[PDB]
Each structure stands twice: as C-alpha cells, then as structure tokens.
C-alpha cells in the first residue's frame, strides 16, 4: 500500500468498517477481508437415514480444508460441492420433490445428484421437408 | 359524404416492422438467513434473538413462500411454452433454419439434449451477454467469492451477512431450449405452433385478414419475407442502441441490486443504539448494558427484515401478474392469432414470436405497416338491383373506371364485385350508394 | 462526516494589516479583533520576498487567546521563513 | 494576506480519490444543491 | 393554505406535518382530450376507432351479430339511433 | 429527552412502514385495474 | 432520528417508486387511448 | 410491569403489522385468481 501518509495507519471503508492497516511495529500493509460464512442447503426425504448437503458455491477442496472433515461421498457439481449423493447428471427427471435450482435435482431410491427436466417435445419421425 | 362517398386514405404500399417486448416473468430468488443477518457470529446476541421467537422463523416462511411461489410461476412459464410443441425427430437445426426466404437461424438454437447447454440462440445470446447478473452470472459471482481476490464484490458481502439469490428452479439454458422448441414448432411440419400450415402461409393469411388482397401478397411473397426478416434484424440491431427492453431487463437486475444494497446497509445503522457493530457493544459494555444495545439493534434489524419482506411480497405479486400477462401472449400471439387488436403489441398485428430473456420472455410483434398512402372516395355500401344492399367484407367500394368495385381497407387494390368480399342484405340501408346496374 | 468545517456561502474576511512605520489604534479594535467562538479556518498567503535572489517566506502572525495578559495563556502562531513557531504562554502581549 | 473564516460544527461530503487525498468537498446544508449532492452521496446527482 | 382562512383545512395540516398528495404527470384535461379524440375517432372518416365504417352501420352490423335480421335494423335506424342517444341520456342522468 | 423522543421516532417510523406496506398493495390493485381498463379501451371501444 | 439511517431513505424510495408506478401506468393508458387515433384536420367540433 | 408489558405490547403491534401486510398481499392474489375464475366463467362455460 502507498495511501497510508505518516500519520495514517486504518483503512475504512465508506460504511466505518477497517479493511485494511498498516503495522505501526514493521510498517507492512494488509488488506482485511472477512472470514467466509454460509449456509447448507440439506436435502431431506423422508424414506431416508441421512441428508444430502449442498454447499453452494463451495468446490470441494475448500469445503473439507476450511470447513470441516467429513467421510461422507463428495464431488463438485455446478452448484457447489454436494455430499451424501451420487453424481448422476446424466440421468434425468420429469418430478422432482427435492429442487436444488439449475434444473438439479436431488433424487432419492441413496441420494442422486440428477438432472431436473419436467417438460419434454412431443417428437414424431415425419420429415420435414 | 360527397353524395354517398366518404374520402379515406388507403395504404398503396406497405413493410413489416418488428417490436420488441420485454414481460417479467421471474425475479432473482432471493433468501435471507434471518439469525446470521441479524446477529452474525455473535452468541450474546443470538441469545438475546433467541427470546424474540418466531421473527425470524415466519422472515423464513414468507420468504421460501415468496420463492416457491417464484417457481412454480417458472414451471407453469415453461409449460406454457412447451405446451402443444410437437417436433420431427429428423429436425436439425444446423441444417434447417430458413424455410419461405424466412430466416430463423438467430432465433434458433441446438435442438436436442446432445448440444448440451448450447440450446440457446444467437437472439437470445446476444440479449444475455448484456446483462451480467442472470442465474449464471449470480452463480459465477457467489463462486468467486472464495477465489482470494482483493476484489471486494458487494455480492460476497451480502452472502457473508445472510443475503444470497439461489439459482432458479429451471436454469435459463432450459428455458432458452424451451423458446427454441417453441420457434421451430413454426418452422417446420407439423407446424404445431403455426396453425397446422407453414410459416410463411400463416404470415400471408394473417395479413390478408387486415384487409389486404391475396393477389399482393402471394405475388410479393419474397418482398414480405425480406421485410420480415428485416424487421428480425431492425430488433436485433435496435439491442445495441439504447433499447428500451434492455433497459426494462437491466430494471430488474438493478432494482434487485438496490433492494439488497439497502437491506445489507441496515447491518450500519445504530437504531439509537451506541454503535451498530456488536463488536464494538461487546467490548465496551458488560452483558446487563450490552444487552440494552443490542436489543435495540436486534428491534432495528428485526424491523428491516420485516420492511423487506413486505416489499418483496408486493414485488412477487407484480412479477405473478407480469407471468401470466407473458403466458397469455404466448398462447395468443405466439401459438395463435387471438382475435384481440392490441393485445399483442400495437398496429395491425401480423404474428409474434417469442424469445428467452433474463427473468422474462422477450416478444417480437411482428405488424403491418402501411409506407404510402392514397386517398380515395369509398362507399360503406350499396343498394344494388332488386334494392338489395351490399356491404364490403374488411374494404370499401370504390368507383374505378366509372365502375362499382371492391378494394381491402388496408392496400388499394380494386377489383371487381363479388360474393366472396361482399355481405349481403334483403333491404339496402339508407344513404347506401344507390347502383342499380350492379349484378 | 461532521467536524468542524468553514460555512460554505460565507465570507472570508483578510485580515491581514501591512503598516510600514506607523501603527494605528483602530487596527487593534474590532471589526480586527474577533471573537473565537468554537474555532476559525485560515487561508494563508505566503507572501515570497528575495533579497539578493534568495527566496523569504513571511506572512501575518496569528494570536489566540482571551485576555491578552500574564495570568493567561496566548497561543501565537508565528512564521520564521520556513520554521511556524507555535507557543502557549503566559506572555505580556502589548498594547499594539 | 490572511483570510479567516469561522468554524463550526457542520456535517460534510468529503470524496477521497484512489490515493486518498481529499479533492472534493460539499457542505451538506449550504445549498439547495449541496442538499442534493449529500442526499445522494454524489457530486453529480443524476438528472431528476 | 396560505390563503389566511379561519378555516382549518385537513389537507393543508398534513401538508404542513410533510403529508402532500402531488398532482399526475398528465393532466385530467388532458387525459379527458385524449378520451375526446378517441370518441370523435368514431363518427367520422376515417373511422380509425370503428373498424373503418361510420358509427351507424358498426351498431347496425353488431346489432345483427347478435341474431338479428338486417331487415328490422335498417328499417329501425331511427328507433335505434333514438334509443342509442336516449341510453346515453339515461347514463347522463344517471349521475345525479 | 432522547428516551421520549426515540419512543415517538419509533412509533412514527412503524406507522410509516405500515402506511407505506399498505400503498404498495393497494397501487397493485391500482395497476391491476388500469390493465383492465386498457384491455377495454382496446377490445370494446377501438374494437369488439 | 439521523442516528437510525436509512429508515426515512427507504420510505421516500419506496413512495418515489410506487409514485413512478402510477406514472408509467397513466402514461400508458394515455397511449392505449391514443393508439392508433387517426383525425381529420378539417375537424371542428363546434359544428360537427 | 409497566416496562415488561410496553415489551409485549410492542412485541404483538408488530407482529399483527406483518401478519396484516402479509393478509394484503395474499388478498390481491385472491382478487387476482377470482378475476380469472369470473373470465372463464364467461369466456369457457357460458361461451367459447
Ligand atoms: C418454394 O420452394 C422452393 C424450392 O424448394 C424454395 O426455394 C428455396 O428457398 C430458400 C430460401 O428459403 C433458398 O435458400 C437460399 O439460399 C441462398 C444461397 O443459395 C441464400 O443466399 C438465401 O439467403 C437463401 O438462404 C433455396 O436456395 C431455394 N431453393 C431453390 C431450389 O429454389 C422456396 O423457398 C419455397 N417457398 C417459396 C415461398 O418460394
Ligand atoms: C516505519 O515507518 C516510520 C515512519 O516513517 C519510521 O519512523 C521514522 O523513522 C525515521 C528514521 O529513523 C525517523 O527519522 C522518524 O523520526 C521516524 N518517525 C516518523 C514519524 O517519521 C520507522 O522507523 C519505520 N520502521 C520500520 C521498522 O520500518
Ligand atoms: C458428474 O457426472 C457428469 C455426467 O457423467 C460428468 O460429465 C461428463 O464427464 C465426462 C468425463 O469428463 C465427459 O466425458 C462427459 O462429456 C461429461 N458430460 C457432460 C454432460 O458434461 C461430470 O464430469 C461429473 N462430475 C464429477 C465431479 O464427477
Ligand atoms: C422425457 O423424455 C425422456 C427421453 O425419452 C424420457 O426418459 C422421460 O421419461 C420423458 N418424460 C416425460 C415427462 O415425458
Ligand atoms: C417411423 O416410425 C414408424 C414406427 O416405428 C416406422 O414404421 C416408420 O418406418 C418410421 N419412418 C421413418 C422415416 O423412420
Ligand atoms: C414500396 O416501397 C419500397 C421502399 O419504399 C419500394 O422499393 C417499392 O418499390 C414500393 N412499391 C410500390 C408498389 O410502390
Ligand atoms: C470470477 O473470477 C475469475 C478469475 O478472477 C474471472 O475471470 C471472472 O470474470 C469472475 N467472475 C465474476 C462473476 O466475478
């Protein structure tokens, strides 16, 4: 930083907040930004013994570095990273009872990770032309 | 009335213009963690939250009410739009995208879930890289919070205080798709979205029920599709400028912004209260007064929530109306020609066509416009042989060539007298032109 | 921000007085001698001399105070061509 | 020449640039137009 | 409300206590100039508010959508005329 | 002072949030009205 | 009452909004009555 | 009691507000669905 004059050691933001100091001890400057905080999206059935989380846009390698261990199943979808469900993408459904948005669902026999799609096209072989 | 003539000016030459219109039909789904809103991290105050109950339990009932409400308006939209939607599994629009000197290569995107997202169209690409803050780029900016930038994104902000937009139901890429199937149901057999008849027939006969000769217009077939098409490219074009659709789409993002912003800058104001940090209260004052301040910041805090879930309420409502406005003009603009004058779009309305839009669809009223005029004296009426009257059928008659004839109302093309644009009556009215030499 | 700021709209009143030998009475008067009140904001000139084209910095000198006297304290705030010599004392202010 | 002016307790729109000098100032209740500049913490409020 | 009247109007008290009502971006002299042009639209060519046929006949040609025969309607053009400006009376009326 | 003054800024505030809540639904019905009088003016009046 | 915030911000941006509402809504009436409006200039109302 | 029960007073004026705002806004959506249901009524059993 070279905005902090001799007399200057806090920078503030236009609402009071310090984000950001110089050391009065070695004179090195920080930026200060706040610690990460959010919430789980758990998808639930009723038929089932676990949850299905959802931490939204969260990839997987922060989650278990930063947030806490699991031995729960993992991987990183398009929402975020999703624990306790199978990643079947691929798969689709026409009903879904656990909406995750982006057309995902969270469907459950375990958990699976699938595609929402509830409208398809009529489709017949005539030709076109 | 010089005698039985009245002078009008009827169109001798006609374009299609095309009008863009934006209707909402969703809004950014946005949820509010009432306790970390509030309180924070701090457990003195989530204690004190604590004793005021179910505030912010019903903040969350109303909100998720307000979101469900979001999407199943989302659902019954794209229902709508795929309603009816029958296509040829032979169809690929890599190859198919004009038909009639008609082009819909913009309109259309990658049919099938084979292209995978790519389903959105040139049109409805080019109208969503001018807004950032669609799902995906809410999607994006959440994700980037954690990227270790110094960037300091108000969005990071806002999720970190409890403020977050979830995604929708259905992402946009699928919607897209869904305008897509939609616009080529027109396009090819069995036209299930244009009356069972190909595109450029149904363009024809929706003109011609404005009053316009078939003569015309299956013998300028090629000068009505370079128009339509031109109109196409007049909207898309018109997006680059100050367009007034685009900016009814940006509205939304904006007000969105501004709502949140105003939520998040209630996090700083005191309410009376020595400061309106709960750090600060907590390392100055002892649990009997820090619990004075805190409650009146927690009162403030509580009352904004409150605030914005009124105007949220009232704002989804308006949005609830605006969907089933959009759903109304695809079944009745898009799908069919309702027999409505200014329902879709203003003019002598021709067609309309509907494309994807970020939290809305995005119609093109298609209409006839009438370039130069001439002005000719026309009879209402006419009390013609056995005193039996006459009326012309969407026209006039004119006298041409010292001779009774019948021209449309909206192109001047005479031509002669028959029972095909002709009503008949038993007893001619009166100041009905008298022609007793007429059949 | 709140602070204690100039009046915008108001007036700046240059009270700077240049005698070269003789000293009027009513220059240590009123309008000239004003009330503090909560405080003031100064705009300086630094009026630049050259003697043998060496460069002189000098403006007026500013006092501070209430009564002028011995048993109270005036701060002077007086320039010496680049040092500002800032005292509070007890001083025998003169008359003139 | 040495301009005086009094002080008082008045509340300002202070904007700092990118290195934090003070270029621009608006005494909030001077002026009609300074009451719009502080109502929306700009120098330039937008057309309305 | 600056008028000086001993009458204490309510509207004038919750303008002075910041409650006001303001007046509509268009005018009701203009909105009813707009509804005067759409009316006038109907009697004359070109009938740009009446499909494109003088009044008359668009009444007759409703009246026979109905079910109607053309025979008594264009005969009755008088009674109809009559009874159309005699119902326009009866709203008039109405009002009071 | 300040004790009874913040009491009667409190009430005022609530009461202008609630008449402000009341004319946001009721200019919904106002918008929702003139939607219909347009529709009107358009398929009874210019047309049938 | 400068101690709460934005408390009176948020009510006149409410109000302002609500207020354009009704504006953009009396203008489209307006427009909706004079769609397509065709007159005659030789028309005289006085006598006609 | 006097300062327990201003607590609750305030307390329940609040939450009655909401529920009231709350009432509004689903009201108009009544009004919304029963303005539909009157159109098909007319438009889809007494006619087509
Ligand atoms: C009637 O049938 C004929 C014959 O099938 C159709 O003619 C075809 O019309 C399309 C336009 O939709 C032509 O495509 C054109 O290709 C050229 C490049 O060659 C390109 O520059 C144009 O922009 C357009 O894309 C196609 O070539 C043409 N084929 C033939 C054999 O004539 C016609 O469209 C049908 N409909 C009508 C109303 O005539
Ligand atoms: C940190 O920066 C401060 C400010 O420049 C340094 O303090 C000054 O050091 C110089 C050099 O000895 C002195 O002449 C000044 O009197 C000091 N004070 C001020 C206000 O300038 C300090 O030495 C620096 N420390 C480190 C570890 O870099
Ligand atoms: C989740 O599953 C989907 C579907 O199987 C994966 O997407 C496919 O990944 C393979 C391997 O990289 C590709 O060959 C396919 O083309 C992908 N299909 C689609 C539609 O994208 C996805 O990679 C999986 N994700 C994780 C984290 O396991
Ligand atoms: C939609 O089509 C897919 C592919 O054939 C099929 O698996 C699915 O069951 C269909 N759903 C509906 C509701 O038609
Ligand atoms: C279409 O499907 C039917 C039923 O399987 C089949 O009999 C027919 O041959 C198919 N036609 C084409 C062109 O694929
Ligand atoms: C109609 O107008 C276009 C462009 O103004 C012109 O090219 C065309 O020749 C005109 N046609 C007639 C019949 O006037
Ligand atoms: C997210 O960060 C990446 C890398 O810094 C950048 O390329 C991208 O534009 C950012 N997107 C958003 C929405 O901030």
Known sequence: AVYYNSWQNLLYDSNGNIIGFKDFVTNKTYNIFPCYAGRVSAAFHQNASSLALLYRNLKCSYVLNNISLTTQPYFDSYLGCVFNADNLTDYSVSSCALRMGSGFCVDYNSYRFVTFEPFNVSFVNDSIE | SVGGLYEIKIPTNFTIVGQEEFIQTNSPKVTIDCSLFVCSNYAACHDLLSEYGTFCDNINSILDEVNGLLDTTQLHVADTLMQGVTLSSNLNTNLHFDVDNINFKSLVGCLGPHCGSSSRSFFEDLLFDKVKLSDVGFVEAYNNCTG????????????????????????????????????????????SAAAGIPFSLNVQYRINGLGVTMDVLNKNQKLIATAFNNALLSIQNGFSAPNSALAKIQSVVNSNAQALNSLLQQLFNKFGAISSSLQEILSRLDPPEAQVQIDRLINGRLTALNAYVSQQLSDISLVKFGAALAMEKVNECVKSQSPRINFCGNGNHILSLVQNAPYGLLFMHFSYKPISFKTVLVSPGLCISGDVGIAPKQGYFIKHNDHWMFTGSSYYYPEPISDKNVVFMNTCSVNFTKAPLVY | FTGYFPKSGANFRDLSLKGTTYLSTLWYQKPFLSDFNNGIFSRVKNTKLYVNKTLYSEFSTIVIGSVFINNSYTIVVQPHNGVLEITACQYTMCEY | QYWVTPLSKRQYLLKFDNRGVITNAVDCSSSFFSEIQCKTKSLLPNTG
Do not use: H
Not at chain 2, 159 to 168: A, D, E, Q, Y
């Open chain 2, 148 to 191: 270790g930038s110094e960037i300091r994104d108000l969005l990071c902000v806002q999720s970190f205080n409890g403020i977050k937009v979830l995604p929708p139901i259905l992402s946009e890429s699928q919607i897209s798709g869904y305008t897509t199937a939609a616009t080529v149901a027109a396009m090819f057999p069995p036209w």
